[PDB]
Design an enzyme around this catalytic site. Structure first.
Site, PDB file in Angstrom:
ATOM      1  N   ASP A 124       0.865  -1.231  -0.083  1.00 40.39           N
ATOM      2  CA  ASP A 124       0.128   0.072   0.091  1.00 40.39           C
ATOM      3  C   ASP A 124       0.791   1.381   0.217  1.00 40.39           C
ATOM      4  OD1 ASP A 124      -3.152   0.430   1.766  1.00 40.39           O
ATOM      5  OD2 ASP A 124      -2.377   1.406   0.247  1.00 40.39           O
ATOM      6  N   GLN A 173      -1.290   6.354  -8.858  1.00 39.96           N
ATOM      7  CA  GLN A 173      -0.617   7.388  -8.660  1.00 39.96           C
ATOM      8  C   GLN A 173       0.682   7.230  -9.241  1.00 39.96           C
ATOM      9  OE1 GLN A 173      -2.519   9.910  -7.717  1.00 39.96           O
ATOM     10  NE2 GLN A 173      -1.821  10.411  -5.545  1.00 39.96           N
ATOM     11  N   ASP A 231      -9.833   3.675  -3.342  1.00 30.99           N
ATOM     12  CA  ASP A 231     -10.274   2.480  -2.795  1.00 30.99           C
ATOM     13  C   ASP A 231     -11.855   2.494  -3.247  1.00 30.99           C
ATOM     14  OD1 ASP A 231      -7.859   2.296  -1.424  1.00 30.99           O
ATOM     15  OD2 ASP A 231      -8.911   2.620   0.483  1.00 30.99           O
TER      16      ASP A 231
END
Ligand SMILES: *[C@@H]1O[C@H](CO)[C@@H](O[C@@H]2O[C@H](CO)[C@@H](O[C@@H]3O[C@H](CO[C@H]4O[C@H](CO)[C@@H](O)[C@H](O[C@H]5O[C@H](CO)[C@@H](O)[C@H](O)[C@@H]5O)[C@@H]4O)[C@@H](O)[C@H](O[C@H]4O[C@H](CO)[C@@H](O)[C@H](O[C@H]5O[C@H](CO)[C@@H](O)[C@H](O)[C@@H]5O)[C@@H]4O)[C@@H]3O)[C@H](O)[C@H]2NC(C)=O)[C@H](O)[C@H]1NC(C)=O
Ligand SMILES: *[C@@H]1O[C@H](CO)[C@@H](O[C@@H]2O[C@H](CO)[C@@H](O[C@@H]3O[C@H](CO[C@H]4O[C@H](CO[C@@H]5O[C@H](CO)[C@@H](O)[C@H](O)[C@@H]5O)[C@@H](O)[C@H](O)[C@@H]4O)[C@@H](O)[C@H](O[C@H]4O[C@H](CO)[C@@H](O)[C@H](O)[C@@H]4O)[C@@H]3O)[C@H](O)[C@H]2NC(C)=O)[C@H](O)[C@H]1NC(C)=O
Ligand SMILES: *[C@@H]1O[C@H](CO)[C@@H](O[C@@H]2O[C@H](CO)[C@@H](O)[C@H](O)[C@H]2NC(C)=O)[C@H](O)[C@H]1NC(C)=O
Ligand SMILES: *[C@@H]1O[C@H](CO)[C@@H](O[C@@H]2O[C@H](CO)[C@@H](O)[C@H](O)[C@H]2NC(C)=O)[C@H](O)[C@H]1NC(C)=O
Length: 417
Positions: free
Chosen positions: A132, A207, A226
């Site tokens: 993450d 990103q 998300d």
């Protein structure tokens, strides 16, 4: 990225992940129950083999002697013990960390500790790492932001400018040497040194233009923020991904996020649309719901043999792509009315999908001349939902319920005309 064994990660990962089911409230029992149900329901038979631990698995309050400690209250036999149990069922075990100083939920994370953590994960027998993107400290932050409409203010048609965001990267910026690329590459390199094979899922939310450098780094990359269990989230991610499909092929798949089948307020139609497009876009398909409470109808949806075969095709690496937007002109970025008409080739023929983004029934027509790889004439057609023969057809017209998707498989030509 290609992996040493020549197979694992080449087509999209199929499995189950705790997050959309349980969020931070996890323990070992939840994983064992998931593993047992994946086998007994036939989901393993359908191809779903990963049981993936998401956030909240470790002791929240720091490393122990420099190592991320499993929360033993949650995992009394450890991650290694759990991996043994899962492996005994013919399944693989995934884990979770973050390319920052803490995970998104505030647990220890791996920035600056990639070799130590990779070694522990491998020693435990973990097979898959979701990595993450929260909590990036100053000296590791990117210089600029990329034009990711989920994270940056946009003008019409999802466009970015430095007037809208003064930190938008200049024209020509090479994202493959950004700090984000470095953070993910560091974990690639750490995992590659281990004597247990661990594939890398790059949970970076689209990103840093991961689309251009991801394939050199991991097997998959999140391409949006998300997911949530509603139609608005489904169409948002569908729209975003519809412009990024040239990044999708063998060993490197855009990840449209964990499935919301069985969750929230998604209707039956909305759920079919979500599953079918996630499959056809060749995203990893990670189930994200408590399988003990999942309806047989939803279990049968997840096992759709045609959608799974398409997703898992070992000859055609590319996904289904939009051939016509529909209500809007082709290539219109729109979060509510994404591209409607999709198609792609496979070993079993051309998959064609037609999404009704209106909130009333609408007639939708698959016209062969519009679809790449097909031409005017008659083809043998099958309905993917019902597995029924639709006949020898010059086109396929269907009444499609609000927010539903018609899905067909176009086989052999059955007349020259
Ligand atoms: C809003 O933003 C979007 C996103 O940024 C902009 O999207 C542009 O829109 C362009 C058109 O305005 C579009 O250009 C077309 O490009 C196709 C070729 O597309 C392939 O190659 C491209 C470059 O590598 C890729 O970008 C494409 O990927 C995109 O599309 C696919 C689906 O098709 C998705 O899967 C993918 O995710 C991505 O979204 C794709 O790989 C050209 O073929 C087309 O050319 C047109 O005009 C030509 C005349 O100069 C003509 O030669 C072409 O011929 C076609 O039609 C003829 C009949 O007239 C036939 O005879 C030919 O056989 C052929 O079929 C054709 O007429 C056109 O250049 C961009 O691709 C797209 N970029 C992206 C990333 O999506 C929008 O413009 C913005 N809208 C507004 C308004 O601002
Ligand atoms: C990210 O990085 C990765 C790794 O570098 C990139 O992966 C690469 O992708 C390309 C593009 O998809 C791969 O090339 C293509 O591979 C396919 C499939 O090859 C395998 O298929 C053959 C067929 O299997 C047959 O099975 C049938 C039963 O199911 C049966 O009919 C037969 O009995 C056969 O057994 C097989 O021959 C191979 O051995 C495989 O096992 C090919 O079909 C493609 O060929 C087609 O495209 C060519 C180029 O256009 C051209 O010759 C012609 O169009 C042809 O029809 C093509 O070769 C490549 O292998 C792959 N690399 C690795 C290491 O796996 C990935 O692309 C990259 N992402 C992006 C976005 O770039
Ligand atoms: C390890 O996990 C346990 C079990 O979830 C956490 O303990 C719970 O903590 C909550 C909130 O304080 C309490 O309401 C529960 O009663 C606890 N359950 C049990 C069985 O004790 C614990 O906080 C976690 N520890 C760390 C360091 O992450
Ligand atoms: C996204 O696409 C939709 C559909 O084309 C746009 O919605 C239409 O907007 C016009 C102008 O308000 C209206 O005349 C129509 O009634 C709308 N149609 C529907 C079905 O709602 C919408 O404006 C687009 N969004 C953006 C920001 O461009």
């Amino acid at each position: 990225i290609v992996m040493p064994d020549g197979v694992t990660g080449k087509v999209p990962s199929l499995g189950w992940n705790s997050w959309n089911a349980y969020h931070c409230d996890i323990d070992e029992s939840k994983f064992l129950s998931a593993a047992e149900l994946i086998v007994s329901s036939g989901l393993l038979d359908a191809g779903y083999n990963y049981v993936n631990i998401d956030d909240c698995w470790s002791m929240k309050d720091g490393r122990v002697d420099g190592h991320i400690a499993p929360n033993a209250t949650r995992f009394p036999d450890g991650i290694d013990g759990l991996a043994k149990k899962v492996h005994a069922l013919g399944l693989k075990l995934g884990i979770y960390s973050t390319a920052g100083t803490a995970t998104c939920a505030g647990y220890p994370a791996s920035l600056g500790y990639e070799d130590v953590d990779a070694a522990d994960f491998a020693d435990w027998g973990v097979d898959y790492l979701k990595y993450d993107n929260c909590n990036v400290p100053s000296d590791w932050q990117d210089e600029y932001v990329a034009c990711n409409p989920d994270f940056v203010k946009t003008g019409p048609n999802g466009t970015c400018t430095t007037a809208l965001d003064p930190t938008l990267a200049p024209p020509g910026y090479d994202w493959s040497t950004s700090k984000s690329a470095e953070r993910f590459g560091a974990m690639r390199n750490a995992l590659a040194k281990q004597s247990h094979e661990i594939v890398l899922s790059m949970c970076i939310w689209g990103q840093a233009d991961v689309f251009s450098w991801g394939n050199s780094t991991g097997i998959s990359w999140r391409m949006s923020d998300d997911i949530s269990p509603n139609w608005g989230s489904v169409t948002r991610i569908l729209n975003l991904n519809s412009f990024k499909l040239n990044s999708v092929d063998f060993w490197g798949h855009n990840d449209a996020d964990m499935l919301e089948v069985g969750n929230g307020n998604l209707t039956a139609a909305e759920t079919r649309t979500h599953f079918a497009l996630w499959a056809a876009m060749k995203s990893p398909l990670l189930i994200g719901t408590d399988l003990a409470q999942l309806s047989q109808n939803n279990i049968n949806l997840l096992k759709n043999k045609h959608l799974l075969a398409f997703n898992q095709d070992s000859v055609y690496g590319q996904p289904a792509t939009p051939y016509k937007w529909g209500i809007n002109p082709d290539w219109t970025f729109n979060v509510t009315y994404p591209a409607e008409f999709w198609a792609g080739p496979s070993s079993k023929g051309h998959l064609v999908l037609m999404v009704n983004t209106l909130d009333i029934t609408a007639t939708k027509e698959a016209k062969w001349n519009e679809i790449p790889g097909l031409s005017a004439g008659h083809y043998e057609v099958r309905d993917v939902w019902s597995d029924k023969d639709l006949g020898c057809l010059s086109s396929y017209k269907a009444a499609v319920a609000a927010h539903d998707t018609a899905v067909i498989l176009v086989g052999k030509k059955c007349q020259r005309w």
